[PDB]
Amino acid sequence: MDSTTIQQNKDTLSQIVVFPTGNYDKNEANAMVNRLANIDGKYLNALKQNNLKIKLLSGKLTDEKEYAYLKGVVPKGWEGTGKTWDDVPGLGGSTVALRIGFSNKGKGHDAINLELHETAHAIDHIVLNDISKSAQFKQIFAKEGRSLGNVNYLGVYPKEFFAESFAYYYLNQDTNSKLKSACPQTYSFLQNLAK
Template sequence: MRTIKKILLSFLLIPAVLLSPMTAVANETSVSPYLMDMIDVRLSENSEENETHVNNIISRLNRIDQRILENVSQSGVTIILSDLPMTEFPEFSNLKGVVPRGHTDTWDNIPGLGGFQSYVRVGASEPGIKNNHGDVNLELHEFGHIVDSFLVDGMTISNEEEFVQIHAEEYEKMFPGQPYFKYVEEYFAESFAYYYLSQDTRNILSSRAPKTAAFLENMHRKVFTITDVKSDGFSLSWDDYSGEYYNVIVNGSVVHRTQDLTAVVDGLEPSTLYEVAVEVRDKNDNVIDKTYVESIYTTAKANVETDRLSALLVEVGKVPESNITPELREAKKEAASILQRIVNEDISQEEVDDATANLSDAYQIFQPRIMEKNIQGEENTFTSETSHVKTMPKHMTWIVILSVSVVLILLAIVYLYYSGREED
């Protein structure tokens, strides 16, 4: 009887074995699905401390406005959360042993990096020498860089004239005696972190840099979300703005007027690039505000799926020509050619898929913005221990877990069987 009880107890442990890797993901049902689409957790061990850190990171990022999370998610950004050095992952292996500009440490010890593939060191959220950065919060600062580069296709927000002027006026007031924030992109990212970290930090931002705070408060209303892109049109939605009505503008012309927060645009040409914006007007027909302009490719009319290629090509189009790599330039040229030829030529789905894969590979290798984390004027002495833990693709994780669990269960059953015989 004791043997049977032991075997039953072993089976009761199966759910705990199988579910333990998932505890590193925030358990809140209210976490934005768009945020979770971007998160890639890669821990060397599922310790309680690591899981707490990961859940806290996700909880803080979840404070960001939903519209911003949705649009950034559509760009295809991935945020790797790990307790391992970034250079242990294939996405950043080319940075191993490289010392970033202005640093004494190599990238192996840098806790954060922003780009199409992003990284945040688990357990390093707080500023300090130990964590090797001076940001008010690491993950929100890094996400600020991501928003700057990927919220609006074809645009870096901090380079827009409106924010450049705000930066020139307020960065010294917000961060006196800190020359690092002369860089407008660093000022944007750190201000973003202050805005979303807590009410206290938001109050500090509002007090010292009111125009910056107002800019960030309104940012989610400056963008719209594109869905259901077809050969002759698309759907779009935006957040509420206190106005009388909205105009949807395509290539400079008003094509739709509505009091709703959604619209459907049709009658467009297939495989064509369009510039789209939404403006809000008051009851006197005066323009109150206008969203950023987004570039949208309509799909091919033929029975070929081009949505992913079109969206990726728009995103790659934002890379300055002076910074683009030869591989990315060639892949971009090939993708544009496919979309242009598909209208009048017989282009296969395989050709479209190949062009998409080539462009995606070239873009992931190219890091449009390598974020450099450091504490100004202080030498970074923190050194991570070298880890030999090998990572694996996410889709392989469950296969490995199940395989190991089955083997352990079988061994436990055999052991308990013979132990029971000895007791009998």
């Protein structure tokens, strides 16, 4: 996106993103907002319309009262790892909650970018009526769903392949080009969705 579109999307995000009370790196929180601002504005305005909040967290997910119910619960695909949601830095779906500082791949999660993956889940569910379960996307997923790797997770769960593809499409020009090369039908699907 051009600098002016980024600023417009950041203004929209000022009424979506909620910053935490506790201590955190303000510059890194701002960088996360900047990355979210690359998401197409139509989706951001629709999240705002639904009063979805992107809660940035100063600590563990399960230390927020609304996620205490996840204390000790093992995420799907994480069985046998000894890890629980207490160790997971982001969640997305009907809500979005994200630990500041944990954006990059490998910061306790496997996504190319935490905030884009989790926000993609919310866009899928809230804005797009679970499009990752649509017949069109199921056909694409059957063909391309392993082509971002993590074959036994992304290749098995279309909601996760959708969220990861969305993150690749919107993070930066490199990941956007990688998605087009590896998953051309997914790329065209996302490009058309934003038209």
